[PDB]
C-alpha cells in the first residue's frame, strides 16, 4: 500500500510541475513553424526538385 | 503422366534443389554468365541415374511437359526441351534472382489473433458485426451468451469466421457468410484482433468478486462468472495478470492481487458471488466441480495468453483464380494439461518410489500456465514437472481459401514444430519423460488435424479437384480403418552434436514404445470451459495407453461410425531423420556409428510407412470392391512412385551413394502428405532448421495441392521463412544458441537478394 | 481519505492543465497556414535499394555525414551501408536476435543495437584491428529495449519495456539518470537538434518531453487512442510528431503544450510504424502498415504523396541530416533510398 502511496504522491508532484510550466499561444507557435518552413523552404531537396548532378543519388560523382 | 507432371515437377524441383553438390550451379554461355541454370544433357543423365525416367525419350518427354507446364524454360527461349547441352532455367529461380515481371505470391497482412470457438445459440451466434473504419468489427455481443463465454469483446476486428478470411471481403458478403453459417448451424471458429497486453477496467462491486485469480508468479485468471461485468469488461479466463492498478504484480502472488479489490478486503475466503464459473482448462473445471460437489473501477493490464501469430498471403493460383493463405503459429492450448494428465495416469498405473513425485509434478503443471510453452532450459534445473512437456512445441497451420451461396474451398494443414525430447539432468523415469514429451505433441498434432477434418477442412488429396468435405470424410474413415500414422521428420545432426545424438536415440526408442497408443473418441460437451473443443483423458499403463478425445455434439456427429461406438484407434509412428547440413571433414567411426544409427531408424521408418501404405491400399481396395477405381488410380501411382524414391533415398544401390544429397526431407513430407499422416517436424532447438522444413513443406503443399504457380514456389518458401510467421517463436525463446545451417542446400537456405 | 483527496487534486491539476491548453488554443495550424501555397505532389522515386538482410529490417539510422546508414535485421545482423555505392561497409553479427533498435553515433565511431534481450550493446567501428567488437553491453533494463539514440559517444538514451528510458554513460557502463514517468511500454524516443530534450512515447498514448540534464519530465502530451509507435522532432526542436496505431499522426508543439495538427485520411486505417520530418519540416514522412510511406504536408495536413515500394510493412524510416534522401527500411529486407 505504501508503494501505491509513493506512486500517487510522485504523480501529484509531477502534474503540479506540469501545471506550473508556462506555454505560448498556438497562433505564435504556428507562426514560428510557418516561419521556419518559409525560411528553410529552398534548402530542402525533398520538397524542391534538386538537379541530378547536384543530388548524390542520380548523377553526382561524389 | 501429363496430368501428374505438376506433382512430379514440384517433386523434381524439391529433389534437384535439395542435394548438396548442386546440378543447377551457375554456368557461363557465350562469355555471358547465366545464374542458376541446368544443362539438358546433365538433367536427363541425372534423371536416368536417379530412376525417374527409365529412357532418354521418357526424360525428354518429361522435360517438354515441364516447359509447356511452366516449371522450367530455356534461357534464350528460342527452343523447346531437347537432349542437348543447352541451358534450361527454372522459373522459380528466375523470379527469385529477377532475371515484364509481376509478383503473384505477395503478403497481404500480418496479424495477431485468438481463436474463439462459439457454439450457435437460438436466435444467432451471440454477436453481430458492423463495418467501422473500412474493416469488420463486432457491433455488439449479447451478455451471458456463448460468444462472450468464448471471450468476444465489442470493437475487436475479426479476421476469419470458420477459416474464411473476411477482412478482404465486403461487409454484405461477410454478413451473408454469418447468417448462412447460422442457418446451417456450424460451430463458429473465429479469429479477432487481440493484442498481447490488455488494459481491462473491471468494475469493483462492493459485495463479491465475480472472478477468481490463482497462481504464484504471475497470477492468472482462474475463472470468470458468466454474464458478469468482468466478462463485459473483457476479463476472460486464463489471462495472466502482469499489473493491477499501476502496481506491478507479475512477480506477486494471488492474495497480493486480490487485495487491490474492495470486496476481497471486506470478505476474504467467501467472495465468489454464486456465478456460472467458466474456467481456463478442463482439468481446472473438473477439479473445481469435484471440489464443490459513482463506480470504482480497477484498471489492470493482463497478458493475453494463448495468442496466435498469423500472416495472410495471397497469390494467383494455377488456374487463374486468386487465392489466400493464413499461416498461424499456435502454442498448443492443451499442452500442460495433457502432460499433467499423462503424469497422473502414470502415477495411477504405478500405484512405490515415484507415484508421489509424479502427482507432485502434475500439481506443478496444473499450478500455472505462464509462458505458455516450455522454452529450452538454460540451467540444469532439478527434476521438475516442466521438463515433461514438449520443449518449444508449436503448431503451424495453413488455412487456404480459394473460390471455385458463395462457393469457396477452405482447407487447413497442421505441421507440428517441436524441439527434440531431451532429458538434460532412473532410466525408466527418463524414458517416461521422453515418452510424455513425444506423446503430448502427438496428441496435439492429431487433435489439430482431427478438428480440421471434422470441421470439413482437411484434404490430403487436393490435386484431383476434390472438395474438402468429401476429402476430410474419406480421411476420417481412412484413419478409422487403417489407423493414424505419425510422420515426424528429425532435422537434427547425430553425427555432429552429442546431445542431438542421444536425443535421436531417445526419440527412436520412444516411438518404438509409443506405437501402441490408441485414440478412442467419445462425446462429452462442457460449455463452461473457455474455448477448447476437445478434452483429453489419458488412461492405461506405460506399455499400452489410451487417450480419449471428448468432442462436441457437431464434431461427434461428423465422426465416422466405427469409432463412435468406443472403438480403439492405433497410432503407428514414423521417424524420418536427415541432417540439414553435409559433413565436411569426414569423421571417425564414433560418428560413423551415429550415421549408421540414423540410416537404421530411417530404414525402420520406411518399412513402417510402406506397411501403412499397403494397409491403405487394402482399405481403398475393399472400399472400391464394396468411377472410383478410375479416380483412385491417379493417387496410387504417384504415391508408390514416392515410395520408390523413398527406397532409393534410404537404401541406395552400390555405385551411386550420397548423390541424392538431403532430398529425403521434402519427399518424405510429400509422401506422408499424400498418405494421411500427422506431420511433426522436430529438431534440436525448434526455430531455425524446423522453420526451414516448415517453409518448404508448406510451399510444397500450396504448389502441389492448392495450385500455387511454380514461378512462385521458391518465392513462397522464402517469404514464409523470412517475412512470415515462426519468427515469433525465436522472439519468445531468444536464449538459445541456434543458427541457420550454413552447409545446407539451396532449397533449405535463405536466398540472398539479387 | 487522503489517497482520494490527492487523487481529486490530481484531477484538479489535470482539469486546469486542460483548460489552460484550451485557453492557449487561440487558433489551429490549418487556419494559420490555410493561405500558403500547397505542396501538391512529391514524386520521389527509388534511387537505391540496399538488399542484404536475411530477415525483416527493424530499425535504421543515418549518420551525420548523410552517407552511411546502419540497419538492424530481425535475425541479428547490423549492416552498415553506404547509401552512395550500395556497398555493405560493415556487417555485424549479434549475440542475440530480434533487435528492434539501432543507433548511429554522430561521430560515426559507434553503433548501438537493442532488442528483446534487454541489453543495448555498443559496437565500436573505427578500431585499430579493423574488426567490429562489442564495447559495452549496457544491461539493467528488465523489459525489451525499444529505441536507442546517441547524444554523443558517451551518452546514450535507451527506451525500454519496463516503462522507463535510461540515459547511460558508456565508459562506466551505467545509468547516469533513469526516466520513470510512463505507465506503458516505452516504444520510441527522438532527441532534439538542441540535444538537451527528447520526447519518449509509450503504449499509454502519452508522449513525455523530458529534459536530459535535470532528469525529470518537462511536459506530457496525449491525444492518441492507441500505442504511440514512433516520435520525431521538427528540425528546430520546437515541435514533435507522433505516429500511433490509431492511424493518426499528430504534430504537437512544445511551447503551446498541445496538439497543433492531426494527419489521417479515411482511406488509411493502418497503424504508423515510423515517422520523421524533412529538412525544412514541410514534409512529414510517415511509414505506415499498408506497406507504404505517405508524405504529408506538415502545415496543411494534405497527403502530398505516397511511396508504395514495399512487399511488407515499413518498420523504419529516416531522412538524412542534409535532407537529401529518405531510407524506408521495411520488413521485406529492403532499404529503399527515396529521393
Author numbering:
A (entry chain G): 5 to 66
B (entry chain A): 506 to 604, 610 to 803, 838 to 895, 931 to 983, 1012 to 1032, 1318 to 1518, 1527 to 1654
C (entry chain B): 2 to 340
Give verbatim lines from the article.
Phosphatidylinositol 3,4,5-trisphosphate (PIP3)–dependent Rac exchanger 1 (P-Rex1) plays key roles in neutrophil function and breast, prostate, and skin cancer metastasis (1–6) by activating small guanosine triphosphatases (GTPases) in response to extracellular signals. This 1659–amino acid Rho guanine nucleotide exchange factor (RhoGEF) is activated downstream of G protein–coupled receptors and phosphoinositide-3-kinase via heterotrimeric G protein βγ (Gβγ) subunits and PIP3, respectively. The N-terminal half of the enzyme contains signaling domains with well-known folds, including the Dbl homology (DH) and pleckstrin homology (PH) domains characteristic of the Dbl family of RhoGEFs, two DEP domains, and two PDZ domains. However, the structure and function of its C-terminal half are poorly understood, and it contains a large amount of low-complexity sequence. This region displays weak sequence homology to inositol polyphosphate-4-phosphatase type I (IP4P) in that it has a canonical phosphatase CX5R active site signature motif close to the C terminus.
We used single-particle cryo-EM to determine the structure of nearly full-length human P-Rex1 in complex with Gβγ to 3.2 Å resolution. We overcame this by collecting and merging together 0° and 30° tilted cryo-EM data to analyze ~900,000 particles and achieve a final structure with an overall resolution of 3.2 Å. Because the ~800-residue C-terminal IP4P domain of P-Rex1 had an unknown structure, we built it ab initio. The DEP2, PDZ1, and PDZ2 domains bury extensive surface area with the larger IP4P domain. Gβγ docks primarily with the IP4P domain but also makes contacts with both PDZ domains. The linker between DEP2 and PDZ1 forms the first strand of the core sheet (β1), fixing the position of these domains with respect to the IP4P domain. The domain is decorated with large loops, including a 285-residue insertion between β5 and αC that is disordered in our structure. Comparison of the P-Rex1 IP4P domain with the crystal structure of SidF bound to a substrate, PI(3,4)P2, suggests that P-Rex1 retains an intact phosphatase catalytic triad consisting of Cys1583, Arg1589, and Asp1638, although the final residue is found on the TI loop rather than on the P loop as in SidF. Therefore, in the P-Rex1 IP4P domain, a structural element within a canonical phosphatase active site has been repurposed to form a Gβγ-binding site. The P-Rex1 binding surface on Gβγ overlaps extensively with that used to bind Gα subunits and other G protein effectors.
